[PDB]
Amino acid sequence: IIKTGDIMFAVLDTSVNSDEPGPILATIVTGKLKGSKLIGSFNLPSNADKMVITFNTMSIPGAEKTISISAYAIDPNTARTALASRTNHHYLMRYGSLFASSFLQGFGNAFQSANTTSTLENAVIGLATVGKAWSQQAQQLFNTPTTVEVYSGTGLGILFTQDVT
Amino acid sequence: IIKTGDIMFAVLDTSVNSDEPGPILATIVTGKLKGSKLIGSFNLPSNADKMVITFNTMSIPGAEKTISISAYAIDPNTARTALASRTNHHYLMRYGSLFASSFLQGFGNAFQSANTTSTLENAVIGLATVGKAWSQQAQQLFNTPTTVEVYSGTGLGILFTQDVT
Amino acid sequence: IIKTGDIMFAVLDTSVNSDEPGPILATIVTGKLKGSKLIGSFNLPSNADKMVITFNTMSIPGAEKTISISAYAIDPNTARTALASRTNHHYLMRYGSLFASSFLQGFGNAFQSANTTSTLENAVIGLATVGKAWSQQAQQLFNTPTTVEVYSGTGLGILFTQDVT
Amino acid sequence: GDTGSLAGLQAMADSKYTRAQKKQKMGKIREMALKETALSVGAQAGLAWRAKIIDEQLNKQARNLDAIYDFNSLVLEHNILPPVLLEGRNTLNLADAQSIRISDRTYKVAKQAHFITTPPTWRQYLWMDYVKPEAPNVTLLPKTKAEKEIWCIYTERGWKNGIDQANTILEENIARIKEDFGGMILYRKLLAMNMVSPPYVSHTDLGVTGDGSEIHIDDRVLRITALPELNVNSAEWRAAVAK
Amino acid sequence: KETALSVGAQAGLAWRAKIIDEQLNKQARNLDAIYDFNSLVLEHNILPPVLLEGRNTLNLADAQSIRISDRTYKVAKQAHFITTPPTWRQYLWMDYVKPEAPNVTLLPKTKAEKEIWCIYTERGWKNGIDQANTILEENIARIKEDFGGMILYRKLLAMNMVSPPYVSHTDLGVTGDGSEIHIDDRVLRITALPELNVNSAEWRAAVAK
Amino acid sequence: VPKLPCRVDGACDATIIKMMTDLNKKGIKVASVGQNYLISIPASALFADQSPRLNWASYSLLNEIAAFLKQFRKIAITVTSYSSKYVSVKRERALTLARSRVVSEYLWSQGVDSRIIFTQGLGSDKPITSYTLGGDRSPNARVEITFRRAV
Amino acid sequence: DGCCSKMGGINYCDSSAGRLVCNNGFYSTCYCTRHAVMDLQFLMGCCLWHGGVYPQLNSSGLVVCNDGYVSEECSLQK
């Protein structure tokens, strides 16, 4: 019997990325649950300011049983839903690619247009033509957000959702 | 028996932004109900003039029960529904990004048009072409709302909605 | 037994803005029924010239009963239906933003046209292209109404609608 | 202001204290939460600290404890614990109106005599139980200097409450052992006064016992036929004297 | 408004209660010197009963319904056993609750509002003082009635108007089993309650000098 | 906390030891052994020449005595008066009795918190000094007042 | 202030007497334990000399003591 809405602790050892869902395991090491293991997966938020883990498959050792407390995780020492990761993963890369493709296009068109008022024309050539394809490709790939990745050596806290016996 | 619409006190303990809904629990601090916990989630207001929390899943320890009295929070010593948070989070960021992209666009077109009447030409080049893509992406992401965030150390006053036994 | 539509004195203790719906409570302070409270809500009028309160959920203490006599409010010692609050919250903000965006557009186009008959060119540049995006965003945000907000220490007069037992 | 209520409500009629009630309504709402927690942690710390102190001081003077509590002197020759007796004096019961019951004295058997294995001591009856707690679990924290100070003074109040609670525990234990020793010595006194029936015990004695694989040499079994009790025939009671 | 009247009533009642309780504490010893009870209790520790005397009885119900007598006597409360004699503390000590909760719903803004607040406060204060004095007077009348009934019983028993209470005690020796024992059992019961005599010839008169 | 008194009402040990020092430096003897306290006063500074008459300044000393007596929580009080041999036995016994009676009367008139007060006198039956030169100026012409402090 | 003031200072508290001891062997005026001989003459509270306040909820503010008596003074005033 576990009452509704309590807090226990676990340790996370297996790291995973927020791109491909799959099994991730933790272990309850304190509280009444001793030796208990836990299989679950992650979910992707709207913005990368938080990350939670859907933890449902709880195997209690001793007997050949596996209970199904479907619960989440909360970060210890903060009691908040943000994750230990970085969120500036793919901002400046696509920013610089788009800006370079632009400046190439601009250099070719303006330094070809202002010729009335050889190698410099080859600079015009190169930037004039490699700006456009890079521009449309940057417009294609600009919509990639920044992922997160849980760590392989950080403990965790777990709040409960449903009761057990 | 709790009267329809009395005022009680509680303390909120875990903090999160109004960005991702999730389980949040608080503790009733006084009165007949002592140490009772209450889990729920939040709701998102249309504008940033206030923020309120919907709390329904009430559990009292001692005896194994879980009532579902749903109630809201009113801001103490103001007797209002506003939240202690900041509201000016990402106004000037998108404002300045849009203004700079537009300024780049204007620099390219007008300083190219002023050629009739090489470094300044390269300035025309750079601002001319990096204005446009940044401007359309800024108009794409300009609709970003300003979020609010609850605190981990603030008490609250709770008005009741229905009776209990 | 209450007469069909008589007037009672009451005190409103909870304040709210006309932004998000929520429960509000007032307290009858004199008369036959003593200590009685009244929860209900508000409705938003078409224009901000007045504000009324939908007050129906009557809780008289002592017993475990909750009658639902609907009642409305008037301004005490004025005998009028207005609200004592402010109706000019967001006139000047959208007015000035729209006018400045327009003036920027006009400055860029007309002082670009005035080149026939560097720094002033950059003035043309900046206002010329930051005017238009700010103008369309101002026409987007021009629809925001001016809200009113009741206060937490104001009494009220409550007229009845039907009879009670 | 409510004591001198005329001037108090005259001052309340001015609207400055209506403003001043707002800034203390926050203390009436927020600040009332930390005090019970401070009381609880002070009570835990005081109980633990006073328990450690009293355990040290009890163990300091252990010689006179078992010196004055010689149960082994009171052990009877069949290793039987003496029973416990209670004496009441000037008995008046008022059951209801129109009714009085009175007696001078009365006697009660509390715990029946029985065989014993080892003599008991004072350690099972007087040693304070104690484990050191090292986990102050804090849920809310003070932020201002004044609320830190009142948190400190409520911790001090909890220290005092834990001290008094531990003293109450020790007082209850010493009253219990006083009750038991007094009952046993009262039994001995009345048995000498020929007020208690002595216990009666027989023994069945058999010789060779068992089969060709399991054997016992001596076989004596002792069983009490008669538990001690009091005597209703008061005529054979013997009084006492002193010179 | 009327809230000022209510808090004036509460404050006047509480303050006058504090004043009158300190006055009752001030006059301590002569109070019990007046209302000694133990000088009246009978020899078997039984509280004497309460008597009621009425004189010059005239009654009407309607036209041709009239009843006239001289004196009437009523047994109010029967005698019973008692452990400790009663005192005046359970008759004259008023309760004292100190409330420190002035809640402000209606608030004055004008000097006229402050003035009517002042005069409502004053009249509620005086009203609460008067109510407290009324309560004290009722309690004084109650304890006076009780003591007068006691004195009336004493004088009627002296003047041979009531049968005395008759009490039997039964004596038993040692009681109980071989585990529980009592020494000297005695049971005190009362067989005859005090009651009036309806035969007037047994009454003995008196004459002073 | 504030309901219970921190100390007894009007009781201050610094005040007690100050007035004790003042009395014993004035010349009124105070004996303090255990809970037992005695005060010895010469009769010359209090009464007249073999007379039951009270000087006007003596009421100040009696007021000082009452101020000292307020500071203790007593139960019983004992007053004795002793004199010198002047005329007879009965005359001195009656004089000491009258002096003890009137000083006990004034002490009870003042605010003593004593349940029981005893007063008596004997005269020159139990002297303390064999030096019998002076008359009423002799130190064995005296008045004693004693008690035991109760808890 | 100091309970053993103008003296050597407080030694300890005899809880049997409920009194503190100064460095000089004289009892101070202060008490230490609550279980001590105070002087109780005036006190607060209501439903006194009765069964105490019945702890039930009620519609009116009438407080009925547990002997059945009703204290209108402890009750509110209409």
Nearest to F65 by CA among F126, F116, F22, F120: F22
Discontinuities in chain D with C to N beyond 2.5 Å fall right after: none
C155–E contact, CB cutoff 8 A:
yes
Q: Which residues lie closer than 8 Å to E39 by C-beta, 6 or more apart?
A: none
Element (H, E) at E123: helix E111-158
Q: Report the structure determination method.
A: cryo-EM
G76–E contact, CB cutoff 8 A:
yes
Of the candidates G17, G22, G29, the beta carbon closest to that of F7 is on G29
Q: Name the DSSP class of B75.
A: B
Token couple for F136: 């009423």
| C-alpha distances out from residue E127 to A23, E8, E137, G78, Å | 79, 8, 15, 12
A100: how many CB neighbours lie within 10 A of its CB?
17
Round to whole Å and give the CA distance between A22 and E64: 108
| C-alpha distances out from residue D209 to D212, F18, F34, G20, Å | 10, 91, 75, 72
How many residues appear in chain B?
Answer: 165
Round to whole Å and give the CA distance between A109 and A58: 64
Q: Which 3 state secondary structure label does DSSP give F20?
A: helix
Token couple for D200: 């009666």
Q: Which of F3, F8, F13 to mutate to test the interface with G (most CBs of G within 10 A)?
A: F13
Nearest to D230 by CA among D75, D104, D71, D86: D86
Q: Name the DSSP class of F19.
A: H
Which residues face A51 on adjacent strands?
none
- Give yes or no for a contact between D50 and D166, defined as CB atoms under 8 angstroms apart: yes
**Residue E34, phi then psi, degrees to nearest 5:** -70, -60
- Give yes or no for a contact between D158 and D42, defined as CB atoms under 8 angstroms apart: yes
Of the candidates A45, A81, A106, the beta carbon closest to that of B126 is on A106
| C-alpha distances out from residue B92 to A47, A53, B97, C89, Å | 20, 34, 8, 21
| C-alpha distances out from residue F151 to B163, F4, G9, Å | 58, 18, 20
Residues of chain F positioned with their CB less than 8 A from the CB of G30: 6-7
Round to whole Å and give the CA distance between E11 and C163: 37
Interface touch C16/B81, C-beta < 8 Å: yes
Which spans in chain G are helix H? none
Interface touch E3/C11, C-beta < 8 Å: no
**Residue E170, phi then psi, degrees to nearest 5:** -115, 130
Of the candidates E10, E93, E98, the beta carbon closest to that of G44 is on E98
Token couple for D86: 């209670």
Q: Which 3 state secondary structure label does DSSP give B113?
A: helix
Q: Which 3 state secondary structure label does DSSP give A19?
A: coil
F4–G contact, CB cutoff 8 A:
yes
Interface touch G31/F6, C-beta < 8 Å: yes
| C-alpha dihedral sign at C74, C78, C82, C88 | negative
| C-alpha dihedral sign at G21, G22, G24, G26 | negative
Chains that touch G (3 or more CB pairs under 8 A): C, E, F
Interface touch B13/D26, C-beta < 8 Å: no
Residue type, D119: P
G49–E contact, CB cutoff 8 A:
yes
- Give yes or no for a contact between G69 and G50, defined as CB atoms under 8 angstroms apart: yes
Q: How far is E75 from chain D (nearest CA, A)?
A: 18
Of the candidates D29, D139, D141, the beta carbon closest to that of B76 is on D29
Residue carrying structure tokens 């004036």: E8
**Residue A98, phi then psi, degrees to nearest 5:** -65, -45
Which residue does chain C place closest to B117, by CA atoms?
A: C115
SS (H, E, C) chain D: CCCCHHHHHHHHHCCHHHHHHHHHHHHHHCCCCHHHHHHHHHHHHHHHHHHHHHHHHHHHCHHHHHHHCCHHHHCCCCCEECCCEEEEEEEEECCCCCEEEEEEEEEEECCCCEECCCCCCCHHHHCCCCCCCCCCCCCCCCCCHHHHHHHHHHHHHHHHHHHHHHHHHHHHHHHHHHHHHHHHHHHHHHHHCCCECCCEEEEEEECCEECCCCEECCEEEEEEEECCCECCCCCCCCCCCCC
- Give yes or no for a contact between G22 and G28, defined as CB atoms under 8 angstroms apart: yes
**Residue D216, phi then psi, degrees to nearest 5:** -130, 140
Nearest to C37 by CA among E104, B31, B6: B6
Element (H, E) at E92: helix E89-92
- What are the residues of chain B with a beta carbon less than 8 Å away from any beta carbon of chain A? 13-17, 19-20, 22-23, 25, 37, 39, 57, 59, 61, 64, 66, 108, 112, 115-116, 118, 121-122, 124-126, 128-130, 132-134, 137, 152
Helix (H) and strand (E) counts in chain C: 2, 6
Residue carrying structure tokens 């000297």: E184
Token couple for A52: 């939670």
Residue carrying structure tokens 């004039």: A128
Token couple for F12: 């201050």
Q: Which 3 state secondary structure label does DSSP give A149?
A: strand
Discontinuities in chain E with C to N beyond 2.5 Å fall right after: none
Nearest to A85 by CA among A9, A158, A12, A161: A12
Q: Name the DSSP class of E201.
A: G
Which residue does chain C place closest to E105, by CA atoms?
A: C11
Q: How far is B75 from chain D (nearest CA, A)?
A: 11
What is the per-residue DSSP string for F11-34? --HHHHHHHHHHHHHHT-EEEEET
Interface touch E181/D107, C-beta < 8 Å: yes
SS (H, E, C) D129-172: CCCCCCCCCCCCCCCCHHHHHHHHHHHHHHHHHHHHHHHHHHHH
Token couple for D40: 């609880």
Nearest to D71 by CA among D117, D108, D127: D117
Token couple for G71: 């204290």
Helices C119-141, B91-113: inter-axial angle, 10-degree rounding: 140
Q: Which of E6, E105, E110, E113 to mutate to test the interface with C (most CBs of C within 10 A)?
A: E105
Q: How far is D25 from chain E (nearest CA, A)?
A: 12
Token couple for D243: 């010179």
Q: Which 3 state secondary structure label does DSSP give E189?
A: strand
| C-alpha dihedral sign at F8, F13, F14, F18 | positive
Round to whole Å and give the CA distance between F37 and A151: 83
- Give yes or no for a contact between A123 and A111, defined as CB atoms under 8 angstroms apart: yes
Which residue does chain G place closest to E28, by CA atoms?
A: G41
Residue carrying structure tokens 């996370």: A12
Q: Name the DSSP class of E200.
A: G
**Residue D242, phi then psi, degrees to nearest 5:** -150, 155
> Residue G49: which region, alpha, beta or left (left: phi > 0; alpha: psi -120 to 50)?
left
Interface touch B9/D141, C-beta < 8 Å: no
Residues of chain G positioned with their CB less than 8 A from the CB of E135: 72-73
- Give yes or no for a contact between F147 and F78, defined as CB atoms under 8 angstroms apart: yes
Round to whole Å and give the CA distance between A143 and F64: 99
Token couple for A92: 């400046």
Which residue does chain A place closest to B125, by CA atoms?
A: A106
Give Rg (Cα) of chain G: 21
Interface touch E95/G76, C-beta < 8 Å: no
Give Rg (Cα) of chain F: 17
C30–E contact, CB cutoff 8 A:
yes
Q: How far is D34 from chain B (nearest CA, A)?
A: 10
Which spans in B54-118 are helix H? 91-113
Q: Which residues lie closer than 8 Å to F73 by C-beta, 6 or more apart?
A: F8, F113, F149, F150, F151, G37
Helices E111-158, E2-26: inter-axial angle, 10-degree rounding: 40
Token couple for D174: 């010493």
| C-alpha dihedral sign at A46, A52, A56, A57 | positive
- What are the residues of chain G with a beta carbon less than 8 Å away from any beta carbon of chain C? 58-60
Interface touch A111/B132, C-beta < 8 Å: no
Interface touch E185/D103, C-beta < 8 Å: yes
| C-alpha dihedral sign at D149, D150, D152, D153 | positive
Which residue does chain G place closest to C30, by CA atoms?
A: G78
- Do A and D touch, 3+ Cβ pairs within 8 Å? The answer is no
Round to whole Å and give the CA distance between A139 and A135: 6
Round to whole Å and give the CA distance between D224 and D204: 11
Nearest to G62 by CA among G74, G49, G47: G74
- What are the residues of chain B with a beta carbon less than 8 Å away from any beta carbon of chain C? 1, 3-5, 45-47, 49-50, 52, 72, 74, 78-82, 98-99, 102-103, 105-107, 109-111, 113-114, 117, 131, 135, 139, 142, 159, 161, 163
Percentages helix, strand, coil for chain F, rounded to the nearest 5?
A: 30, 25, 40
The distance of Cα A22 from the centroid of its chain, to the nearest Å, equals 14
**Residue D47, phi then psi, degrees to nearest 5:** -60, -45
Of the candidates E1, E105, E107, the beta carbon closest to that of C27 is on E105
Round to whole Å and give the CA distance between C45 and C145: 11
Nearest to C88 by CA among C156, C19, C149: C149
> Residue E2: which region, alpha, beta or left (left: phi > 0; alpha: psi -120 to 50)?
alpha
Please give the angle made by the CA atoms of A28, A34 and A39, to the nearest 5 degrees: 40
- Do B and F touch, 3+ Cβ pairs within 8 Å? The answer is no
Round to whole Å and give the CA distance between E148 and E155: 10
| C-alpha distances out from residue B82 to A80, B91, C15, C16, E2, Å | 22, 20, 10, 8, 34
Strands laid side by side in the F116-123 sheet = F29-33, F36-42, F142-148, F76-82, F116-123
| C-alpha distances out from residue A147 to A44, A86, E113, Å | 9, 8, 67
- Give yes or no for a contact between F31 and F40, defined as CB atoms under 8 angstroms apart: yes
Residues of chain G positioned with their CB less than 8 A from the CB of E95: 45-48, 71, 73-74
Round to whole Å and give the CA distance between A129 and A102: 11
Interface touch E2/C30, C-beta < 8 Å: yes
Q: Which 3 state secondary structure label does DSSP give A117?
A: coil
- Those of residues 89-108 in E touching chain D at CB distance below 8 A are 99-100, 102, 104, 107-108
Round to whole Å and give the CA distance between D109 and F134: 75
Q: Which 3 state secondary structure label does DSSP give C140?
A: helix
Residue type, B157: G
D19–E contact, CB cutoff 8 A:
no
Which residues face G65 on adjacent strands?
G53
**How many alpha carbons lie under 13 Å from residue D42 in its C-beta half-sphere?**
20
Round to whole Å and give the CA distance between B56 and B73: 11
Residue carrying structure tokens 């309120």: B52
The distance of Cα E33 from the centroid of its chain, to the nearest Å, equals 17
Which residue does chain D place closest to E99, by CA atoms?
A: D2
Round to whole Å and give the CA distance between E174 and D106: 9
Residue type, E163: S
Q: Which 3 state secondary structure label does DSSP give E72?
A: strand
What is the per-residue DSSP string for C33-99? S-S-EEEEEEE--SSTT--EEEEEEEE-SSSS--B---EEEEBTTTTB---SS-S-SSSHHHHHHHH
Strands laid side by side in the A154-159 sheet = A65-67, A53-60, A36-42, A24-28, A7-12, A154-159
Q: Which 3 state secondary structure label does DSSP give E2?
A: helix
Nearest to D221 by CA among D234, D202, D196: D202
Which residues face A54 on adjacent strands?
A41
Q: Name the DSSP class of E188.
A: E
Residue type, F136: D
Helices D145-192, D34-60: inter-axial angle, 10-degree rounding: 40
Residue carrying structure tokens 């009627």: E156
Of the candidates E7, E11, E184, the beta carbon closest to that of D104 is on E184
Round to whole Å and give the CA distance between D61 and D64: 6
- Pairing of β B24-28 and β B37-42: antiparallel
Interface touch D229/E186, C-beta < 8 Å: no
Round to whole Å and give the CA distance between G78 and F150: 51
Token couple for B144: 């970003």
Q: Name the DSSP class of G49.
A: T
Please give the angle made by the CA atoms of E109, E115 and E118, to the nearest 5 degrees: 110
Nearest to C33 by CA among C5, C8, C55, C67: C8
Q: How far is C79 from chain B (nearest CA, A)?
A: 25
Q: How far is G71 from chain C (nearest CA, A)?
A: 19
Resolution (A): 4.6
Interface touch E97/G73, C-beta < 8 Å: yes
Please give the angle made by the CA atoms of B94, B100 and B102, to the nearest 5 degrees: 100
Q: Which 3 state secondary structure label does DSSP give F75?
A: coil
Token couple for F33: 């052994």
Give the F:G interface size as CB pairs under 8 Å: 41
Element (H, E) at F100: helix F90-109
Q: How far is E119 from chain G (nearest CA, A)?
A: 19
Please give the angle made by the CA atoms of D110, D115 and D119, to the nearest 5 degrees: 90
Round to whole Å and give the CA distance between D139 and B35: 12
D162: how many CB neighbours lie within 10 A of its CB?
20
- Pairing of β A53-60 and β A65-67: antiparallel
Residue type, G35: H
Round to whole Å and give the CA distance between E203 and E198: 10
